[PDB]
Amino acid sequence: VQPTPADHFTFGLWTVGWTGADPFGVATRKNLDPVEAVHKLAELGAYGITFHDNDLIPFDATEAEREKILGDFNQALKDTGLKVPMVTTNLFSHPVFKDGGFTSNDRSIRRFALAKVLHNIDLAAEMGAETFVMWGGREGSEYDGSKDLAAALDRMREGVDTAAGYIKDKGYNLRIALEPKPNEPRGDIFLPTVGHGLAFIEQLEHGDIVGLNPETGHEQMAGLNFTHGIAQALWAEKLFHIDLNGQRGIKYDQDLVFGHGDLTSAFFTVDLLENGFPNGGPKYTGPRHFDYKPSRTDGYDGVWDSAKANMSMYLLLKERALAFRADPEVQEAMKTSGVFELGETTLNAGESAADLMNDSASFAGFDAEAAAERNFAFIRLNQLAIEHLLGSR
Amino acid sequence: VQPTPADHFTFGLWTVGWTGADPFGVATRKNLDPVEAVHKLAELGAYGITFHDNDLIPFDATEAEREKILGDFNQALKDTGLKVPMVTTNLFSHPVFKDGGFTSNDRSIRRFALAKVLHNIDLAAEMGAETFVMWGGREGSEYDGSKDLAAALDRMREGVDTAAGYIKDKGYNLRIALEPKPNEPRGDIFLPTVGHGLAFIEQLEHGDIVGLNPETGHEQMAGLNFTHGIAQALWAEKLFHIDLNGQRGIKYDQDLVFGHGDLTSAFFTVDLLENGFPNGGPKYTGPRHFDYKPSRTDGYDGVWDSAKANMSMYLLLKERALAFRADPEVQEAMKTSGVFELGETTLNAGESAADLMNDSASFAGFDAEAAAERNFAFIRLNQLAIEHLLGSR
Amino acid sequence: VQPTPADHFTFGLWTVGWTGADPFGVATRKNLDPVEAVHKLAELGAYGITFHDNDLIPFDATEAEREKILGDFNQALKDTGLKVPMVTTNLFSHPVFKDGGFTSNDRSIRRFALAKVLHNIDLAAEMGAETFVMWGGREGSEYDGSKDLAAALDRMREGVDTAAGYIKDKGYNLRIALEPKPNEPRGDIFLPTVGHGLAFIEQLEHGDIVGLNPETGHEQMAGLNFTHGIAQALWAEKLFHIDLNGQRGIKYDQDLVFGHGDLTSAFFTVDLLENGFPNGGPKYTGPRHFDYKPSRTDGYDGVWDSAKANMSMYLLLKERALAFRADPEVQEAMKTSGVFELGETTLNAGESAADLMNDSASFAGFDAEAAAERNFAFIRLNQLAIEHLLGSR
Amino acid sequence: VQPTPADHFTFGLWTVGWTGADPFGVATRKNLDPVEAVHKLAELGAYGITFHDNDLIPFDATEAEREKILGDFNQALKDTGLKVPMVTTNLFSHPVFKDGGFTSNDRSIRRFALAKVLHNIDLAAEMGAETFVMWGGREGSEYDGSKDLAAALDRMREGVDTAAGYIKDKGYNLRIALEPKPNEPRGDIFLPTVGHGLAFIEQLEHGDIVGLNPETGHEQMAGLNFTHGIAQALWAEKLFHIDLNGQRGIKYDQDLVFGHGDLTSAFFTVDLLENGFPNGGPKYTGPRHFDYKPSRTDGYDGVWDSAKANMSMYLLLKERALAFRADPEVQEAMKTSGVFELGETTLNAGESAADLMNDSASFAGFDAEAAAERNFAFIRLNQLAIEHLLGSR
Ligand SMILES: OC[C@@H](O)[C@H](O)[C@@H](O)CO
Ligand SMILES: OC[C@@H](O)[C@H](O)[C@@H](O)CO
Ligand SMILES: OC[C@@H](O)[C@H](O)[C@@H](O)CO
Ligand SMILES: OC[C@@H](O)[C@H](O)[C@@H](O)CO
Ligand SMILES: [Mg+2]
Ligand SMILES: [Mg+2]
Ligand SMILES: [Mg+2]
Ligand SMILES: [Mg+2]
């Protein structure tokens, strides 16, 4: 498996660029020049690169420097042909954002945070980004009395709707994608899972251009099924972007290589992204973005091995998932378990609630004890998937 | 603290009625007659009782028996004055529902499950229930390939919309409340948290009469902040009912007495139910339903002590939460931390996105380093709440 | 992959015999005759069968009944050739054990529980069992004030030393294996993890014949690394038995087929059982016992498929783990990463503490920043392992 | 509540000195001069101060610099009267320790790490410290194949026995306290929980002067009962020290003020430290050390308020726990529930195994169903405890 730009594999500048400082220690690697990053990613088969405003342009940088940095950055995009599909803003690193960007208790920080996002939408448009991600990493609290919970959501809505209306007013060809996270760095983050993110978007004025940017590790920190989560995002037509990585359990966010976390769940994620639904339905056609961090124990060879590893892992899984669905033993097992049977409507065309109630065969003369004898054979179906995954079928 | 019917404290028949069979052993207590239950609850100060169809009427019961059981049941309501504010259906105990009610892979079980719900709406209306709860406990899977995830949600929508349209057609004065649960008994349940529940309702045809029925322990099984969750349900105008209990961690669902789980979070839950939001906003005015189970180690004295305990716990907490908010030291601490400041809009009346961007004072001439020096004093604010909670202020 | 008795696959009678009742519902399968489990398991390739005293002999069995039942089970054993490597006691199902057996608060119950175990040692001995498992499932509490925690451990020790003393006294060739579990059925169980099990054994008078029976799902319920836990048990030479199953996260104990949980972790448990430690050390050599439950969704074909799936899962992993370590590329990766270098003593032959602090090369003139440049390439090594696991290598 | 040095409240220099940097952002506070921490903590009521070698003396300090810094810190100690009960080593911040100190894969690094500890023992000894803490934060792995798990424990043992041997050899009055932690900064840390810590100590040559330093948040990160864990450490007489803080769930280690986490659990830890075991047993008598971090949202008033909050939280809990056990109603509840009955041996004075199995009253004619009728009334006892905790009693 060798990735090619047609695979649509994008990487964030901060991923490979992650130097190793964790809470208990300092960087273990030297800074990675962004132009070096572009050249190396492009040679590995990457289609595009994403970044946070401050990943490329320092917070203090003068206008001269911004322009200098951008010019070299754009040259490298040109030299290689790497695209920039998604742009995001850093509203969490600087001490000013310690209580949040949009939901900062301080009004002057909320205005600063929002102006930072508005300027960043202009650079996104300029770069050719199709998606603008918003990860509200410091929106939340450690203590329950720190915030007025309704005001926190009024304030989150106000910023997202202001950013959304601004895209609409300039006619930028951009969608906003919100990224849910249960905790870390805040004790409790607002919009903690895919569900809260999706619900939130239905209360927005400009909801039509606001979707989600779910991350594997993030849902797994709440012990949720990532494939069930993305399935619901997809079903709602809100799966706008995706961040792929690995996590081994409910603990700090590990940010491992995709596939180095929960392997079986990674296989079913690849099956949904690549194959979609068994009865047919929506499909996710966007970039396959890897949002991970190369372990601080490894040197730069490990950084480039790690980036290669995301792509191979995904291609190995895809192959196994195409073999699995194409298998006639599997398709027949699927039939036995009712996968296709779930696809038929419960009610007959034209039947009503009154009709169903009063139909003796569906209720009053229904043999519940006979219907309960059905062997759904979910275990055997699950064993077929694992054997395809182990490359044994 | 002595509860009175004005406190609006409701109990499920299955709570006090829980005999003690867990996965590792059999009942430790004798069945509790429902008429005994009504009389005992009413003498403890309860306002109402709730039930699942099969809690009162056996699955096999003939029509004669149903009528016999209902007549005695209604007599007891009359004798005591206990109301029946919520009714629910058991779509999880019988072997026929082993793959689910509405999302059963088998079509004949989906029709049986839905007819069961439609008949149960009629009894709910007849009883005077204002809420019809739906806990899809067996909707989900253990294995990711068991279900077509999009079809599972089409099928859940079809049943909830069929039940919703039926209420509308008969003009019953009832709302449907969905109850999210991450897992148990299924490995992964569909609509696992408040967020997924709320999101789901926005895709329904009859969404206007569908809200939620969040449960303390259920959100805590995903390690979520219950007060943040209910705050978002409230903010959306979807907090239709509430199930209160305790849970100590991510583990099986314990169903302890409210307040015997995460005590500090219980205090902030009571503050939101009773006091609402600091800047003002929505309020939950429904019943305070306790959905717990008296520990299998205790005999019937423990059952009635446990039921008393829910009410006292809630009243103790309420008292402490009224003292806390009424305290001028607390109100001034609140002011210092920006609780009221979060209530002001980010943008000035009439200001636009373009206006804000270009306002030098909010961005280009904004001193980020000076604004980051602010002592939010969240720790001291949190210490004030705990001291009010410990009954020391 | 086809298991043969040489593989040592053992199954508990309660595993394939699990009926399907859980907290929210009744049994979905009819009881399994023990004769039939024996014959069936002999046909699939099982080496042995294990049981709890009440799996086989009812609580209330008369003497004549006990004899018939053992006559029937000994006949099956003789006819099939299956062995009985482990026997355990049910100190959790009867309502008498609602607060524990050995650590029950009631003294009369502690005495009955120990008497129930003593009698079971005799039976274990008559079956030709090598291991006697102790899973104290009801030993614990829901509430912190329910127990005197120092008295609970003296009571546990009393119990286990009385049982060990008796073994020695009767001259039985039986070792006791204690099975840790963090929670369920109690809120908190005593001796919650492998480490707590090992620690307790060292306070025992007859600790020489007492070791552990760690189970996969149990350790994963506290979020621990099951392979790290059994390596510590192995290292102290206390790994007497093992229970293999799958667990998908911190939640109720799922009891899935081995490998249907955390796959990579399963892969690495199989490497440690098959290959042992990279630098040499003790090796586990007892039964590979499966303590799982066929999902309640599945009918009896599912039951024998699930039994089979355990043994295939193990044989596919074993095939991969042996290929993994035989690969020259992997052996090279391991060396690079320092896996063999970890096996060399830190100190030199006859080097004292004073000698090493004195040595200037080791400390005072040690170049900490050049040593920190080593690329351990742990990511690459992990990628190699996963490629072997996926059968792409 | 006003703490006095008689209370034994000790604080680490790194606690109040924590600057605010985390994974997603930079420091929000300026460095704290150690002289100032000493004076400030003496003014709040602290009994002592603890530190890591590099909290005080920079990694790269010259000899002259080291002397100045110790002269400055000894002067502060002399001026304030504060003691130095514990000293620890930083084997996690330098990039050299990226794979561990003691269990690093690189042998040159293991040697430097142990040399770094030996030198620190001398310093500990010169400060008049009673305890030497060992927190192996970088000992572990992200990936299962990175380590030889039997070799990692031999390397750990080597390290800890070399340090213990040296203590004995120099005649220092110092005990080693090992501090378990399940994860963070590594994916999986070696000796993850109190039980694993205790187990390992028993494989040590010089285990007599090696015990534990359990921390509240660490045990809660695996979801364990912190009070049950320290009771097992106490029971084996291995509770040498303790680190108190708060943790709200299975997630990153939060380091909140003691009591700002799980309150009820905190209540019950304070009862065990203050009141000991209901039936008598060992009692903990060392420092009550706070290893927490003032939230990064708070400025320096917040820092001294947080230091204060730890000691008030402890004194409010202590006040409640002493009142709790003094209450005649509580003493009665405890007796009813069998808390004292658990403290009676199961067997009679000189009763053998054979004697008890023989006794017909204990087994053969034991009435299991009448014994099962006991109401343990654990719920009522829990309600009494929580009412004492809320100061309503
Ligand atoms: O937890 C970190 C988040 O994953 C970010 O990397 C977003 O994807 C971009 O701000
Ligand atoms: O987990 C069980 C659920 O809480 C139910 O009790 C619903 O509230 C009613 O079906
Ligand atoms: O959690 C259930 C346990 O795994 C038991 O089956 C033991 O293995 C033997 O009682
Ligand atoms: O997880 C961090 C630890 O608690 C440390 O502060 C130790 O207590 C000493 O290194
Ligand atoms: Mg991301
Ligand atoms: Mg409920
Ligand atoms: Mg087991
Ligand atoms: Mg600590």
XYZ file of C-alpha atoms in Angstrom, chain B residues 13-21 26-34 36-37 294-296 298-301 303-304, chain C residues 95 98, chain D residues 369 372-373:
34
model
C -42.927 1.436 40.670
C -39.822 -0.537 39.611
C -37.537 1.453 41.951
C -38.959 0.441 45.339
C -40.367 -2.678 43.648
C -36.790 -3.824 42.658
C -36.365 -7.207 44.273
C -32.626 -7.571 43.893
C -31.778 -9.883 41.022
C -31.409 -13.862 42.525
C -33.914 -11.567 44.283
C -33.322 -10.862 47.948
C -36.764 -9.424 48.635
C -40.347 -10.478 47.979
C -42.477 -8.827 45.263
C -44.042 -5.556 46.268
C -47.760 -5.262 45.567
C -48.450 -2.112 43.520
C -49.030 -1.376 48.812
C -46.463 0.701 46.869
C -32.596 0.093 46.933
C -29.401 -1.994 47.484
C -30.015 -5.781 47.478
C -31.130 -4.215 52.699
C -34.586 -5.581 53.601
C -37.905 -3.652 53.223
C -37.064 -1.161 56.010
C -36.446 0.024 50.784
C -38.573 2.668 52.639
C -29.294 -14.291 48.590
C -25.638 -10.611 49.457
C -32.704 -18.825 53.618
C -30.450 -14.223 54.087
C -33.358 -12.291 55.635
